[PDB]
Amino acid sequence: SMNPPPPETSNPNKPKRQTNQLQYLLRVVLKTLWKHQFAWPFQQPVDAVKLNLPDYYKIIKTPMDMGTIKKRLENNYYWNAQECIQDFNTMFTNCYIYNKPGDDIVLMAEALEKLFLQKINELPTEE
């Protein structure tokens, strides 16, 4: 069995910014979700080999996870906050697409998403 290459976290020719919204996405949003008791399934790319999910990457073609997001934020990969918000939403959506309603991992995603939405609701104004 085989995993795909992970999403890109480094690309020297991608233009980059460090903005107050992106700082909030790291300091408040990522940190809040990362420390949660339900974070662990989402802290790294889905390992379809270890988890015995041979169809995962047949179904999920835009993988995303908080390990990748953390690396992107720490390495100033983004130009804007919308790119990062999209990554979180991709992560949640993948979970809901692949799994069955009411599965433990879906409940976990929902709890993290609730917090995500509460924090993004107060995304600061651009400086």
In short:
The chain has helices at residues 20-34, 56-59, 66-74, 81-98, 104-120. With 127 residues, it is mainly α. Residues 17-123 form the Bromo domain.
CATH topology call: Histone Acetyltransferase, Chain A
CATH-assigned homologous superfamily = Bromodomain-like
Q: For the record, what CATH class applies?
A: Mainly Alpha
Query: Helical element count?
Result: 5
Q: Helicity, in percent?
A: 40-55%
Number of strands: 0
Q: What is the second-level CATH architecture?
A: Up-down Bundle
How many structural units, i.e. domains? 1
Approximate strand percentage: under 5%
The helix/strand series, from N terminus to C terminus, equals: HHHHH
The best one-word shape is globular
> Which class do the helix and strand fractions yield?
mainly alpha
Distance between the termini: 47 Å
Main β sheet profile: none
* Radius of gyration based on Cα positions: 15 Å
PDB class: signaling protein
Keywords: BRD4, bromodomain containing protein 4, Structural Genomics Consortium, SGC, signaling protein
Assembly: monomeric
Entry title: Crystal structure of the Bromo domain 1 in human Bromodomain Containing Protein 4 (BRD4)
Description:
The structure is a monomer. The chain is mainly α and 127 residues long. The protein has a single domain (19-123), classed as Histone Acetyltransferase, Chain A, CATH 1.20.920. Helix content is 50%, strand content 0%. The chain contains 5 helices and no strands. It has helices at 20-34, 56-59, 66-74, 81-98, 104-120. Helix 1 packs antiparallel against helix 3, helix 1 (20-34) packs antiparallel against helix 5 and helix 3 packs antiparallel against helix 4 (81-98).
